[PDB]
Structure formats: C-alpha cells, structure tokens
Amino acid sequence: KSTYRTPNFDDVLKENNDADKGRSYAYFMVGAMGLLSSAGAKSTVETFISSMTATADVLAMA
Amino acid sequence: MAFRKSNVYLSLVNSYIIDSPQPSSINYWWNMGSLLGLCLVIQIVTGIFMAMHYSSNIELAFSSVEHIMRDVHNGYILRYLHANGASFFFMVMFMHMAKGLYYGSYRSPRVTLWNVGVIIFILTIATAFLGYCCVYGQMSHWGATVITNLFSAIPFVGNDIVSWLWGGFSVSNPTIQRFFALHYLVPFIIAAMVIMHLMALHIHGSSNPLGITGNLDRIPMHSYFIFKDLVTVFLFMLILALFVFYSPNTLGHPDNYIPGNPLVTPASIVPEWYLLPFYAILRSIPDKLLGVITMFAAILVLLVLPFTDRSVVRGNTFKVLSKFFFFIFVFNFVLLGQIGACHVEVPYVLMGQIATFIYFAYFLIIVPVISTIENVLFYIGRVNK
Amino acid sequence: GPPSGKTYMGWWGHMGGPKQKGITSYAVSPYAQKPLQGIFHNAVFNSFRRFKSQFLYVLIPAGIYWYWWKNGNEYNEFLYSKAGREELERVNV
Amino acid sequence: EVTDQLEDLREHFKNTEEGKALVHHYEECAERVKIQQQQPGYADLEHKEDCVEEFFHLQHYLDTATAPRLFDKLK
Amino acid sequence: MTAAEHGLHAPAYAWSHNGPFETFDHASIRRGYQVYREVCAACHSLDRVAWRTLVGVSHTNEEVRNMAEEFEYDDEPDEQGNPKKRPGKLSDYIPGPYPNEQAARAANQGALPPDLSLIVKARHGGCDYIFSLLTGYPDEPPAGVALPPGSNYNPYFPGGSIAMARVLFDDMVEYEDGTPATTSQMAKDVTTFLNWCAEPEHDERKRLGLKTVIILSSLYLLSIWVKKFKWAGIKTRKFVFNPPKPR
Amino acid sequence: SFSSLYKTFFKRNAVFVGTIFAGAFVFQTVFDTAITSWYENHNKGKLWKDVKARIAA
Numbered sequence A: 001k002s003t004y005r006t007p008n009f010d011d012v013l014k015e016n017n018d019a020d021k022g023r024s025y026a027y028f029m030v031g032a033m034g035l036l037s038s039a040g041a042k043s044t045v046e047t048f049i050s051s052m053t054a055t056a057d058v059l060a061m062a
Numbered sequence B: 001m002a003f004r005k006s007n008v009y010l011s012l013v014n015s016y017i018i019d020s021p022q023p024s025s026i027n028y029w030w031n032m033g034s035l036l037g038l039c040l041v042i043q044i045v046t047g048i049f050m051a052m053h054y055s056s057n058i059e060l061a062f063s064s065v066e067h068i069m070r071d072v073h074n075g076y077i078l079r080y081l082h083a084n085g086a087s088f089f090f091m092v093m094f095m096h097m098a099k100g101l102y103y104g105s106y107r108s109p110r111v112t113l114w115n116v117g118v119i120i121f122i123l124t125i126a127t128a129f130l131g132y133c134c135v136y137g138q139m140s141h142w143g144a145t146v147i148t149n150l151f152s153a154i155p156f157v158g159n160d161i162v163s164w165l166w167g168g169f170s171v172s173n174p175t176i177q178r179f180f181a182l183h184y185l186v187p188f189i190i191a192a193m194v195i196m197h198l199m200a201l202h203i204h205g206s207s208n209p210l211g212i213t214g215n216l217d218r219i220p221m222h223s224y225f226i227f228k229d230l231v232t233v234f235l236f237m238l239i240l241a242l243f244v245f246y247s248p249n250t251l252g253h254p255d256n257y258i259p260g261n262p263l264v265t266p267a268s269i270v271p272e273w274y275l276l277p278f279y280a281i282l283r284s285i286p287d288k289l290l291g292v293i294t295m296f297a298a299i300l301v302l303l304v305l306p307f308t309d310r311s312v313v314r315g316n317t318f319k320v321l322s323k324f325f326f327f328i329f330v331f332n333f334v335l336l337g338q339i340g341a342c343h344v345e346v347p348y349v350l351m352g353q354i355a356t357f358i359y360f361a362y363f364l365i366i367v368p369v370i371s372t373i374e375n376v377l378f379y380i381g382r383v384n385k
Numbered sequence C: 001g002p003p004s005g006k007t008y009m010g011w012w013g014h015m016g017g018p019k020q021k022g023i024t025s026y027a028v029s030p031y032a033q034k035p036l037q038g039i040f041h042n043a044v045f046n047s048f049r050r051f052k053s054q055f056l057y058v059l060i061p062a063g064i065y066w067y068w069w070k071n072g073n074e075y076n077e078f079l080y081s082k083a084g085r086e087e088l089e090r091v092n093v
Numbered sequence D: 001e002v003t004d005q006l007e008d009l010r011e012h013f014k015n016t017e018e019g020k021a022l023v024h025h026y027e028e029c030a031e032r033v034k035i036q037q038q039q040p041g042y043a044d045l046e047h048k049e050d051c052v053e054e055f056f057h058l059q060h061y062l063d064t065a066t067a068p069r070l071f072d073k074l075k
Numbered sequence E: 001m002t003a004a005e006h007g008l009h010a011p012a013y014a015w016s017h018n019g020p021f022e023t024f025d026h027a028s029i030r031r032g033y034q035v036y037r038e039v040c041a042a043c044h045s046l047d048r049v050a051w052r053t054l055v056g057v058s059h060t061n062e063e064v065r066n067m068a069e070e071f072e073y074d075d076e077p078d079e080q081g082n083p084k085k086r087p088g089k090l091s092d093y094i095p096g097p098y099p100n101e102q103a104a105r106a107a108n109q110g111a112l113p114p115d116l117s118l119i120v121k122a123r124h125g126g127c128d129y130i131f132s133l134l135t136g137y138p139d140e141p142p143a144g145v146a147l148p149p150g151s152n153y154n155p156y157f158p159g160g161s162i163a164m165a166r167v168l169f170d171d172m173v174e175y176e177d178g179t180p181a182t183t184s185q186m187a188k189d190v191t192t193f194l195n196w197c198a199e200p201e202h203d204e205r206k207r208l209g210l211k212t213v214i215i216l217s218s219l220y221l222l223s224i225w226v227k228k229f230k231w232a233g234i235k236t237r238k239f240v241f242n243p244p245k246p247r
Numbered sequence F: 001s002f003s004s005l006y007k008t009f010f011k012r013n014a015v016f017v018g019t020i021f022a023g024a025f026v027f028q029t030v031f032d033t034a035i036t037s038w039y040e041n042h043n044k045g046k047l048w049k050d051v052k053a054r055i056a057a
C-alpha cells in the first residue's frame, strides 16, 4: 500500500465540520470547567482565610 | 530558544511537567504520584492552618483540637480534611507501591528510585504516627505508650532510649510537645525527599505497562497527561469530599474523643487502620525484640525486591503465575490489616503468623521461584529442539 | 554544567531508541473528531472483554482469603459462646 | 394516660410465633440455673452457668423487630 | 471475648437526621435540653458547650440569658483582693454538678460519670447506643449473673454491669409543648440533644457537602470530556509499516 | 450565527476569561441561594425558625 493513501478515519470523523461550531462546543466545555473550578478555588481560599480571621469566643467577648 | 527553556526556574518546571516525555502507553495507575503530590500539599496547608490554633501541652492538646472544631470558622473542615486526607494519602501511597511492584518499576534502571520511595514511606509512617499522637485521645496516648515501649526490648540501651523519647518517664507534656515539633518537621523532610524522588525518576523516565522500552513514541506531559491527571484529581477530591462532609469519623476510632487518661486502658489498643498490617506483623512474633526487628524487616524487605526478581521481562502483564501470586500477596496484606484490628484470641494468632510468613515468603521465596519457572516456560514454549 | 552519566532516555531529538524507517503515522484534528465516540459500545463489550480476561487472578485469591476470614471468624464466635466452652478451655489452657 | 411505646412494642413482639420460642428457651435456662443454685454446695463449682446468651438472643430479636417502627410512634 | 464482654449491639433506629440531606429536629434538641437539665445535670457535665451556642439552635437569646444568670461563676477579685462571684453570661460554659473528680466519685459510689459533651462520638454505635443504653435496663438481670452491689444490669453496656441506675421513668418531666413525655420520648430527646452537643456543625456540614459533591461531580464528568477531547488525536492514530528496501 | 458567537466570546482570551469570571460570580451567588432554599424546604418543620414560630403561636 502507498503512503499517499491515508487510512479509514470515518468511524470517528464528524460529518459536518464547521470550524466555529466545533470550536465553540469545545471552548464551551473547557469554559464550564474553568468556571466551576474558579468558583471552587475562590471558595477554598476563602475557607482558609476565614479560618484565620477570628474565633467564636474572641467574638463572644466583643 | 523559548523563554520556558531559557530560564533557570522555568527550565526546571518545563523539564519536569511541561515537556517531559512520557510513554504513551501508561494507564491510570500512573496518576498516583501526582495524586500523592496533591495529598502532600493538602496535608501541609491544612496542618499549618490548624497549627495556628493548636496548643501542644498535655492539658491543652485535646481541648485545643475541640477549640478548632467548635470555635474556629470552618475548622471542622480543616480537621476532617487533615485526618481523612492523611488516610487518603496512605491509600494512594499503597496504590503507588502496589503499581510499582506489579509493573516491575523497582527493577534495575530504577533501584535508587525505589529506595528513595522506601525512605519516603518510612517517613510518612513516622509523620502520621506523631500526628495521631498529637491529638491526645485515648487511642492516641496508649498507642504512644505501646509503640514507644517497643524500644525497651533492646537489651543494653533500651531503657535510656525510651526515657529519651518520652522526655521523662511516661508519655506526658514533654512527649506531646516533642511529637508536635517533629510532626511539623518530618513533612518538610518528606518534601525534600519527594524532590529527590523526582530527580531520580527524571534520569531514566517512567516505565510503562508493557515493560518494553518506551523510547519509541513519547508524548510531552503538557496538554495530555496534565488533563489525564486532572481527571483523577477531580475524582479524588470528589471521594474525599464525600468522606469529609458526609461520613467524617468513619475511618477513625471513636476512642479518640475520650481525652487521654493514663490510668484507664481502653481494652483494645489499635492504631489507625493503615498501620494495622505492620501492627499484626509485630504482634505475631512471641518476643518483643524479634517483634520490632520483624516489623522493620517487613518494611525493609521492599529493598530485596530488585535482587530476587529473577526474570528477563519487566512486570506481570504477560505472566500468569506472577499475577496470581501478586493478588495472593495483596489479599494477604488486607487479611493482615484485618487481623491487626482483632484481639489476641485463638484462630487469629495462627492466622497472623501464617499471613506474616506469606508476606515474607512472597519477596524471598515466591518471586525467585516463579520468576525462574516463568523464564524457562517462556523459553521452551517457543524454541524447538 | 558538567556532563552526567549515560542514561536510558534522552530528549526530543535524541531519545535513544533504535533507528526508525518506513513507519508512517496519521492522525486527525480532535476539533474535527467526535470525542465520546463508541462509549456505549465500549462500555458494555470492551469492559466485558477486560473483565473476562482479568477476573480469575483477582477473585480466586479474594475467594481464598474471604473464606479463610469467614471460617476463622466463625470459629472464634463459636469458641467464645456457651456451646463451645470446653474446646476453648482445651485450646488455650 | 400514655404508656411507654418501647415496652408496648416489646410485649407485642414477645407475643408472636417464635418470640414465644425464644422466651421459652430463656425460661428453660432460667429454671435450670436456679435448680442448680438450690443444690447443696453451689458456691464452689468454679464455673456457674448463666442465661446471658439466651437473654441476648431474645433481646436481639426484640431489637430487630422494635427498631424500625418505634420512631413512628414517638413524636 | 464473649458476647457479654462485648455488649449487645444497638439496633438501627430511624433517627430524623440519618441521611445525607437531613437535619437535627430542633424541637427535639430543645426538649432534650430540658430532660438534660432536669435529670442528667445532677451527675453529668457539659464542659464544652458554651451558653452562646444554644442561642438560635434551641432557645431564644433571653431564654438563654436567664438560664445562664441562674448560675454563679467566679468573678475577678475585688479591689481588696477578696474572691467574688458573678451571675453567668453568654460567654460562659455550662457548669458541671461537681467541683472536682473526687467529689464525683464520692457522690456516685466510686464511679465517675463521664462528661456528655462528646459521648455520641466517643461511643461505638452513637445515637443508637445512647438510646438503647438509656432504655435497655431490664426489670431484673438474667438468671445466673452475680451483680456486684451498687451496680445495675444493662446488656448494652460492655460487661453488663453499669454504675448508673435507671434514670428515665414515665412522665418525670413535663414538656412545655405538651408532648407525652414517656421513657422512649425522653431518651429520643436527650440523644438528639447530646448528638447536637457533640456535632454542632451538623446542618451546615451537610449543606456544604451537597454543594461540594454537586460541583465536584460536574467537574469530574466535564474533565472526562476534556481529557477525551485532548487525547482524541492520539487514540485515533494509525501506523503503517512498509518495510524499507535492503541497502 | 456561530461565527458571531465565536467572534464575540471565544476569539480573544481576555473576553473569554472575563466571561469565565463573570459566570463564576453569578453562579456562586445563585447556586448558594438555590442550595439553601432546597435544603430548608427539604427540612421543613425541623429548623429553628419553624420551632420558633410554633412556640410563638
């Protein structure tokens, strides 16, 4: 077989290959992952900082 | 050249995590190392933010832990995260070691990597024992006394090394303040040893589940294995958030909510669950000196593995007897862990002795004989004469 | 810096494998592919192939050790009961 | 006016088919132990039988029966 | 050890906070505080529970202020250096009945009553153990035991002999919401209260756990998709070998 | 108009991470309120404000 004859990729190729459609799909999924991980990262850095802030008894004698 | 190569620090970061050529064949068991890195960062950060509120005297240790639980904002998150993250660190570390001795990662290009791993394992066991001793419950105190009175079996200097460990005459205020200073300290020695682990790995690169060379197709670590590690990172955080928020005192013992009392024995002194197999190994020998020698031998027998593996192909991917006896070893370890949590009653001492013998006969008897048999079967199955 | 010893993995350009000739590799852009392709077929057929090849090695030692633990636990619960006290007093004393 | 719900459920499940058999085994043991007690020279036997195991079987069945349906009765 | 030395296992009652979306019944905690104050406070302590932690969980601010002011704590000494006393405030802790351990052991026949502020985490079984221990006292020990004098039979206590006699009897407390206060109802209420005293973070912990488990499950599945999208080009790679000509 | 959707949201990475952060802000707020209201409506008659209304009625 020659090397100019590329193999059968048709089981995994999508049949409509618009650039903007597939790019917006992929960037929507990685954008949702970035959104949720950014909210989670904000929440854990606030968990540690609010751990450092003050205490129930120190606020009780206020 | 690129700025990520033409720097001093970004050169190291690039060489280790960005352009690191990984074999493309490596499966999901090659994420345990980045998982242990995440676990180590979790332990160090949550421990620092709890040491900001912990007081280490014997009359203030337990109540300072409950001050963290009840009075510090999100402090139950920190304590439950530290305790369950320590136990998750050990489950992932057991998976890292079991992968390593399944796939033959201990073998001849990577023996110094295996040995730096064994040093890291000993240091993490010590760190978690000290940190369990800092909370000063009832299992904490009596665990400290039985494990430190192990060292009185040395027939010449044993009483003076145990009186040097205790700082006095039994586990009290100097012992607890010592154990806090050391339980801080040994994690940074572990971080240095992890940097040395990565340095010893980086010279030859990682193995692969085939055991053949991986030099032929390779993939840079960025954008492929970064995301393949991100999958297991989010799975591990999911399972840890389950155990932290819905089931937090499950892996722990209930007797660490009794404050430490030197006059009342809690009628079954057991350590945390991950030290139960070595506890059963220690308990199986009917002598104390031979008991601690056999426990330290049970963890130093991981060093005889690159010299007793007598076969020409690396790993158990293509061997049937190595696979079978590997899983015999793994369920022997699980039975040993369950024997270590039971009392010294009549079937359990014999079961623990036989399981300890199987644990030692795996490294010293089973792996050479099965390796040689598989060698000659691989030969005569395909050569004609 | 100084040069260090001979390793078994180089870098991009001098990895240290054999010379390669006559191997062509083809690959399509993932932006032009379908991810999650064949997941419902692989989820039931490939997983059954993997289970069928790799389950005797896992579930024969698991069965041996679970039967051992069950039998020893039954013997202990028998010996520390009223019906089995005579064998307890001869098995320890 | 209101009687304790747990002893109500315990007597109701003591009046069932095999609950009577468990109670009967307990009373068989109890009369056996007391006519052991009334024997001359009882405090020297070095191992005196009790009925704690039969009481445990009865109380374990009563626990499994009364457990999932008591808190409906409590407020 | 034998089953008597282990103790009988407590069954699984259907608590209103069993389950991952549930919450303490706060009326049960208020009634359980009343049963603690009227029965349990004679012998057991609550050394870790401040007065201010009850405000907004089981009682109102003035309702806690009056219960704290009905006690007397050690004040700072006056200008002549003599010791002084003080009505309690919200900052103080719930005082025990005894001044030290020796008074406790003297008053309760040698045995020391444990402080109840962590007792459902300190015991294997938890709420089921506390409930079944309080309601587990038979009217007579089983035929054969030799109970030491000053001790009572309870099969859920390990060994059987416990130094606490049966304290809960029918209609010994009257609730202010008209609940029929029987033995089972009072044991349910104290065990809910002691579980709150051990875990006062329980509701917020379960709510936050809902938030993290939802966010992390979504992130896990979304990361599976992004991994498969990145590795598509390597999973669909094809190799062809034409053997090179001999030279 | 997928070309217009791409050209406004995903072409510049500044605009991309800007809407990532804006979505994380509004998601954090309304996700918090939705989880609290579901948790409180699931636990009806058990929270403190229900017992407070009962002893005030």
Ligand code: HEC
Pocket: E035, E036, E039, E040, E041, E042, E043, E044, E108, E111, E112, E113, E114, E116, E119, E123, E130, E134, E157, E158, E161, E162, E163, E164, E167, E190
């Ligand atoms: C008077 C004296 C009382 C009263 C009114 C109560 N308790 Fe109990 N308690 C008491 C003693 C002296 C002991 C020690 C007995 C022993 O042998 O240890 C106890 C024991 C408990 C325990 C622990 C049991 C165990 O360790 O498994 C719990 C829990 C307990 N007591 C709780 C309790 C509750 C909830 C009460 C409510 C009214 C209560 N006690 C009454 C002494 C006394």
Ligand code: HEM
Pocket: B040, B043, B044, B046, B047, B048, B049, B050, B051, B054, B065, B068, B079, B082, B083, B086, B087, B089, B124, B127, B128, B129, B131, B132, B133, B134, B135, B183, B184, B186, B187, B190, B252
């Ligand atoms: C190598 C990583 C670490 C491991 C494996 C580890 C392990 C443990 C364990 C098992 C406990 C007992 C948890 C419990 O049962 O309550 C503990 C407690 C503790 N650890 Fe660590 N630890 C690590 C790192 C650190 C570090 C670096 C610090 C200090 C900054 C630290 C501070 C503490 C403190 C203060 C406690 C007190 C008790 C508690 O709050 O739970 N830990 N540690």
Ligand code: HEM
Pocket: B029, B030, B031, B032, B033, B034, B036, B037, B040, B093, B096, B097, B100, B103, B105, B106, B110, B113, B114, B116, B117, B118, B120, B121, B190, B194, B197, B201, B205, B206, B207, B208, B302
């Ligand atoms: C703090 C604990 C540890 C960390 C952070 C760590 C880190 C790593 C990392 C990141 C890798 C590369 C990824 C991988 O191969 O999985 C690795 C590989 C390895 N580690 Fe560890 N490790 C730790 C503990 C251990 C232990 C306890 C051992 C065994 C005694 C060990 C032995 C190995 C081996 C043999 C490899 C090479 C495996 C291979 O690629 O074939 N490590 N380690």
